[PDB]
Amino acid sequence: GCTVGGSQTEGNMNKFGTLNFGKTSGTWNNVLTAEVASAATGGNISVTCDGTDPVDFTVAIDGGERTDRTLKNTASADVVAYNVYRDAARTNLYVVNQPQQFTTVSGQATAVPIFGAIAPNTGTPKAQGDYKDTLLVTVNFGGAVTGQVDVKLNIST
């Protein structure tokens, strides 16, 4: 058997972790980054399987609450687009609903890295406040577990 590590059960859902982009003013000049911090330890989500042989699994991430990976501040209608990648260099997007291919490492927890990015926004001021989204991450073992990742950005003064 296999399980997804770092997950917490809360009200008949699994919470895998948080993708927190931090704090910024309503415009910003740099790429904003984040990495999923698991609910349990603040590290990567992972997969562990019993037995010694490697196991094939996939990881698919949806488009969030609005389908287009946008963070939203409820008070305003304002949104900020983002995306998630498997790699630090952002060469490998988690395409919406398309599985990424993994193998477990024998006898070890196997990381499922999730990197977030928000492009610079030098020209369009966003309203102050908390921005949120929730991604659903599905882990399927080729031999299924869905969890929530809470995405966060705060726009301050």
CSV table of C-alpha atoms in Angstrom, one decimal:
chain,number,residue,atom,x,y,z
A,1,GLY,CA,0.0,0.0,0.0
A,2,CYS,CA,0.9,3.6,-0.6
A,3,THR,CA,0.0,6.9,1.1
A,4,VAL,CA,0.5,10.6,0.6
A,5,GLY,CA,2.6,12.0,3.4
A,6,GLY,CA,2.4,15.4,4.9
A,7,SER,CA,-1.4,15.5,4.6
A,8,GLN,CA,-3.9,16.4,7.3
A,9,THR,CA,-7.5,15.2,7.5
A,10,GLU,CA,-10.0,18.0,8.2
A,11,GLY,CA,-13.8,17.6,7.8
A,12,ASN,CA,-13.8,14.7,5.3
A,13,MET,CA,-11.2,16.4,3.1
A,14,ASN,CA,-7.5,16.0,2.9
A,15,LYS,CA,-5.4,19.2,3.3
A,16,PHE,CA,-2.0,18.7,1.6
A,17,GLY,CA,-0.6,22.1,2.4
A,18,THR,CA,-0.3,25.8,1.6
A,19,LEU,CA,1.3,27.8,-1.2
A,20,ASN,CA,2.0,31.1,0.4
A,21,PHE,CA,3.4,33.9,-1.8
A,22,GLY,CA,3.8,36.3,1.1
A,23,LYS,CA,3.3,40.0,1.3
A,24,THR,CA,3.5,42.7,-1.4
A,25,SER,CA,2.3,46.2,-2.3
A,26,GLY,CA,-0.4,46.5,-5.0
A,27,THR,CA,2.3,46.5,-7.7
A,28,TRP,CA,5.6,44.6,-7.7
A,29,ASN,CA,8.6,44.3,-10.0
A,30,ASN,CA,9.8,40.8,-9.4
A,31,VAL,CA,8.5,37.3,-9.9
A,32,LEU,CA,6.8,36.2,-6.7
A,33,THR,CA,7.5,32.6,-5.7
A,34,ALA,CA,6.2,30.0,-3.3
A,35,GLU,CA,6.6,26.3,-2.7
A,36,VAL,CA,3.9,24.0,-1.2
A,37,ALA,CA,4.5,23.6,2.5
A,38,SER,CA,2.8,20.5,3.8
A,39,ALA,CA,0.1,20.8,6.4
A,40,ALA,CA,2.0,18.4,8.7
A,41,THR,CA,5.6,19.6,8.6
A,42,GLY,CA,5.9,22.5,6.2
A,43,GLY,CA,8.1,20.5,3.8
A,44,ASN,CA,7.2,18.8,0.5
A,45,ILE,CA,4.2,16.5,0.1
A,46,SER,CA,5.4,13.0,-0.5
A,47,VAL,CA,4.5,9.4,-1.3
A,48,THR,CA,5.6,6.3,0.6
A,49,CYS,CA,4.8,2.8,-0.5
A,50,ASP,CA,5.2,-0.4,1.4
A,51,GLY,CA,7.4,-3.0,-0.2
A,52,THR,CA,10.8,-2.6,-1.9
A,53,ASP,CA,9.9,-2.3,-5.5
A,54,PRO,CA,9.4,1.2,-7.1
A,55,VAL,CA,5.7,2.1,-7.7
A,56,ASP,CA,4.4,4.3,-10.6
A,57,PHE,CA,2.1,7.2,-9.5
A,58,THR,CA,0.9,10.3,-11.1
A,59,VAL,CA,0.1,13.8,-9.7
A,60,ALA,CA,-2.4,16.1,-11.4
A,61,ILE,CA,-3.3,19.6,-10.3
A,62,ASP,CA,-6.5,21.4,-11.3
A,63,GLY,CA,-7.1,25.0,-12.1
A,64,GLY,CA,-8.3,26.2,-8.7
A,65,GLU,CA,-11.7,27.6,-7.8
A,66,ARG,CA,-12.0,29.7,-11.0
A,67,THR,CA,-10.4,27.0,-13.3
A,68,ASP,CA,-7.7,29.6,-14.6
A,69,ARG,CA,-5.4,29.6,-11.5
A,70,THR,CA,-6.3,33.0,-10.2
A,71,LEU,CA,-6.0,34.2,-6.6
A,72,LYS,CA,-9.1,36.4,-5.6
A,73,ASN,CA,-9.7,39.0,-3.0
A,74,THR,CA,-13.4,38.7,-2.1
A,75,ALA,CA,-13.9,42.4,-0.9
A,76,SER,CA,-12.8,43.7,-4.3
A,77,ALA,CA,-13.4,41.5,-7.3
A,78,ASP,CA,-9.6,41.7,-7.9
A,79,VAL,CA,-7.7,38.7,-9.1
A,80,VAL,CA,-4.0,37.7,-9.6
A,81,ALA,CA,-3.0,34.9,-12.0
A,82,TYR,CA,-0.5,32.3,-10.9
A,83,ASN,CA,0.9,28.9,-12.0
A,84,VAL,CA,2.4,25.8,-10.5
A,85,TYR,CA,5.4,23.9,-11.7
A,86,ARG,CA,7.2,20.6,-10.8
A,87,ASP,CA,10.7,22.3,-10.9
A,88,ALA,CA,12.4,25.3,-9.5
A,89,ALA,CA,13.3,26.5,-13.0
A,90,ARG,CA,9.7,26.4,-14.2
A,91,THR,CA,10.4,24.3,-17.3
A,92,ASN,CA,7.8,21.7,-16.3
A,93,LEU,CA,4.2,23.0,-15.7
A,94,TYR,CA,1.6,21.0,-13.9
A,95,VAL,CA,-0.8,21.4,-16.9
A,96,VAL,CA,-4.4,21.7,-15.6
A,97,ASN,CA,-5.8,18.2,-15.0
A,98,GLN,CA,-2.9,16.5,-16.7
A,99,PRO,CA,-0.9,13.9,-14.8
A,100,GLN,CA,2.8,14.3,-14.1
A,101,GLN,CA,4.7,11.0,-14.1
A,102,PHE,CA,6.5,9.9,-10.9
A,103,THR,CA,8.1,6.8,-9.5
A,104,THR,CA,8.7,6.1,-5.8
A,105,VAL,CA,12.2,5.7,-4.5
A,106,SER,CA,12.6,2.3,-3.0
A,107,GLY,CA,12.1,2.4,0.8
A,108,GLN,CA,12.0,6.2,1.0
A,109,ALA,CA,9.5,9.0,1.0
A,110,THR,CA,9.3,10.4,-2.5
A,111,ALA,CA,8.9,14.2,-2.8
A,112,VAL,CA,6.1,15.7,-4.9
A,113,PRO,CA,7.5,19.2,-5.5
A,114,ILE,CA,5.1,22.0,-6.2
A,115,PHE,CA,6.5,25.5,-7.1
A,116,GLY,CA,4.3,28.5,-7.5
A,117,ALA,CA,5.0,31.7,-9.6
A,118,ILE,CA,3.3,35.0,-10.0
A,119,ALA,CA,4.6,37.3,-12.8
A,120,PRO,CA,5.7,40.9,-12.1
A,121,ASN,CA,2.9,43.3,-12.0
A,122,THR,CA,4.4,46.8,-12.5
A,123,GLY,CA,1.4,48.5,-14.1
A,124,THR,CA,-1.9,47.6,-12.6
A,125,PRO,CA,-2.5,48.3,-8.9
A,126,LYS,CA,-4.3,45.5,-7.1
A,127,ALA,CA,-6.6,46.2,-4.1
A,128,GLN,CA,-5.2,45.7,-0.6
A,129,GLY,CA,-6.3,42.5,1.2
A,130,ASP,CA,-6.0,38.8,1.4
A,131,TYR,CA,-6.1,36.9,-1.9
A,132,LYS,CA,-6.9,33.2,-1.9
A,133,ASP,CA,-7.4,30.1,-4.1
A,134,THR,CA,-7.7,26.4,-3.4
A,135,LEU,CA,-6.1,23.9,-5.8
A,136,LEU,CA,-7.1,20.2,-5.9
A,137,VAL,CA,-4.2,17.8,-6.2
A,138,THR,CA,-4.9,14.2,-7.2
A,139,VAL,CA,-2.4,11.4,-6.6
A,140,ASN,CA,-3.2,8.2,-8.5
A,141,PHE,CA,-1.3,5.0,-7.9
A,142,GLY,CA,-0.8,2.9,-11.1
A,143,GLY,CA,-1.2,-0.4,-9.3
A,144,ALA,CA,-6.5,7.6,-5.5
A,145,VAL,CA,-6.0,10.5,-3.1
A,146,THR,CA,-7.2,14.1,-3.6
A,147,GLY,CA,-6.1,16.9,-1.4
A,148,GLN,CA,-6.4,20.7,-1.1
A,149,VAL,CA,-3.6,23.2,-1.4
A,150,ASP,CA,-4.5,26.6,-0.1
A,151,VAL,CA,-2.9,29.4,-2.1
A,152,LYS,CA,-2.3,32.8,-0.4
A,153,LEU,CA,-1.1,36.3,-1.3
A,154,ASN,CA,-1.4,39.4,0.9
A,155,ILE,CA,-1.5,42.9,-0.6
A,156,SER,CA,-0.5,45.4,2.0
A,157,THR,CA,0.1,49.1,2.6
